[PDB]
Design an enzyme around this catalytic site. Sequence first.
Site, PDB file in Angstrom:
ATOM      1  N   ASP A   1      71.063  76.617  35.033  1.00 39.42           N
ATOM      2  CA  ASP A   1      70.488  77.361  34.136  1.00 39.42           C
ATOM      3  C   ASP A   1      71.296  78.520  33.865  1.00 39.42           C
ATOM      4  O   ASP A   1      71.180  79.441  34.840  1.00 39.42           O
ATOM      5  CB  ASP A   1      69.038  77.742  34.595  1.00 39.42           C
ATOM      6  CG  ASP A   1      68.422  78.554  33.099  1.00 39.42           C
ATOM      7  OD1 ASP A   1      69.163  78.945  32.286  1.00 39.42           O
ATOM      8  OD2 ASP A   1      67.219  78.926  33.258  1.00 39.42           O
TER       9      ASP A   1
ATOM     10  N   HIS B   1      67.336  75.086  31.769  1.00 37.09           N
ATOM     11  CA  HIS B   1      66.204  75.951  31.445  1.00 37.09           C
ATOM     12  C   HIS B   1      65.255  75.422  30.807  1.00 37.09           C
ATOM     13  O   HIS B   1      64.082  76.255  30.573  1.00 37.09           O
ATOM     14  CB  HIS B   1      67.359  76.759  30.205  1.00 37.09           C
ATOM     15  CG  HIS B   1      66.686  78.222  29.653  1.00 37.09           C
ATOM     16  ND1 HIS B   1      66.243  79.282  30.673  1.00 37.09           N
ATOM     17  CD2 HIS B   1      66.219  78.556  28.567  1.00 37.09           C
ATOM     18  CE1 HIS B   1      65.921  80.107  29.988  1.00 37.09           C
ATOM     19  NE2 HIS B   1      65.598  79.805  28.801  1.00 37.09           N
TER      20      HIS B   1
END
Length: 196
Positions: A159, A172
């Site tokens: 992420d 994410h």
Amino acid sequence: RTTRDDLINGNSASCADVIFIYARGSTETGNLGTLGPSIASNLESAFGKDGVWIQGVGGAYRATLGDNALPRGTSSAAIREMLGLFQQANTKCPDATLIAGGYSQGAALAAASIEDLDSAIRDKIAGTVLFGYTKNLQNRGRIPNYPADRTKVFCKTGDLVCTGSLIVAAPHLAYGPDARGPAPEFLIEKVRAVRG
């Protein structure tokens, strides 16, 4: 279920023992977005429906994508808003234990607002769970002026927003299971330790 106004529609004559203020990610629906509801359902499971208030940061928090690029990763309007809800919690229910949370921009929102918060109200926030924390690098895995031991950051490998980027990659979008288990469990642990 993605809009909760438990605090706002709450009154001092009938307070919850716990108040959860939460900030959503950019362009998410309501004041809770994709992760807020699962967290909130689980809390209500721990403390009972009448035992916990669920409050999304709405109002001036428009959760706009361009606002991530601002200095603290969100607008001042948004920060003033979230601070006001913390304040409203403190006045309406001064015996309440507070908890807090955010995803992406809203993780930036929570962290900016909790830094700015009067130390007296901040002291009552027993725990804060952040997902895809966009200032994770900039603030070294922490919320400025708040204990690491009351903070839990979920920042998946790959992420990119956790390592100083605003590029959204697949990791994410995968905080689903975290908001359903780990996150609220951390919140629940923290509240129970404080309250007895």
